[PDB]
Swiss-Prot record:
It comes from Homo sapiens (Human). Its main location: nucleus. The chain holds residues 361 to 598 of 598 of the full protein. The keyword Calcium does not apply. It is found in: Nucleus; Cytoplasm, Cytosol; Mitochondrion. Residues 1-232 form the NR LBD domain. This is Nuclear receptor subfamily 4immunitygroup A member 1. Transmembrane segments: none annotated. Fetal muscle and adult liver, brain and thyroid. The NR LBD domain binds the lipid A moiety of lipopolysaccharide (LPS) in the cytosol. Acetylated by p300/CBP, acetylation increases stability. Deacetylated by HDAC1.
Amino acid sequence: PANLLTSLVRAHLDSGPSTAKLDYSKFQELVLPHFGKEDAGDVQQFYDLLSGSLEVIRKWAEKIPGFAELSPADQDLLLESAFLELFIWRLAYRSKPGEGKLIFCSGLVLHRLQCARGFGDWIDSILAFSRSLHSLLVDVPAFACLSALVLITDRHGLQEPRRVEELQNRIASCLKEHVAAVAGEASCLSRLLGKLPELRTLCTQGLQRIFYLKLEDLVPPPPIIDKIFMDTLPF
């Protein structure tokens, strides 16, 4: 319901670090001028940061009611298709863009300039989207619904597209009820939903970055990221 909202909230909160579990031991407030542009260590870091979210997102998804009742092929295709978008959406919400501070799902905290060489300019686009999301003051329950809506969505190749749309609709209406219960019986809802296409567009820049890095080939992508990259190219 109801129970659906609670389940979604609980899945969200169990998929990320507690405040008390944040790790600042690598964090730098003042980042020294760096002599270089990307090297192998910056590329490896970028791929390690993406990889650190694969298992987390998969376990979160399996707690969404109904997700495990989709065909196994539909589940995998939804997860592959949404992976960058989910990695970015959850990062944007967890991070503190007013301090240039990125907070990863392990609890690792890095300043912008500490991972900018790996991410490239995409990191600035990500912090701009994070500042925009933060201004909206999205509460945890609405966020927990939106995340699920990022994943459970139409994609090309689904075996049971209507069943994906039915589940999406359940989640969308759970969100809409919640937003009325906090604002009762337009603007706010359409503003939450409007972040989803923005997110997808932002993630085109992630695919661009991975293409560039594979072209440069200092460090190849790990196999699961590479598969997600190749499977989500529509050509």
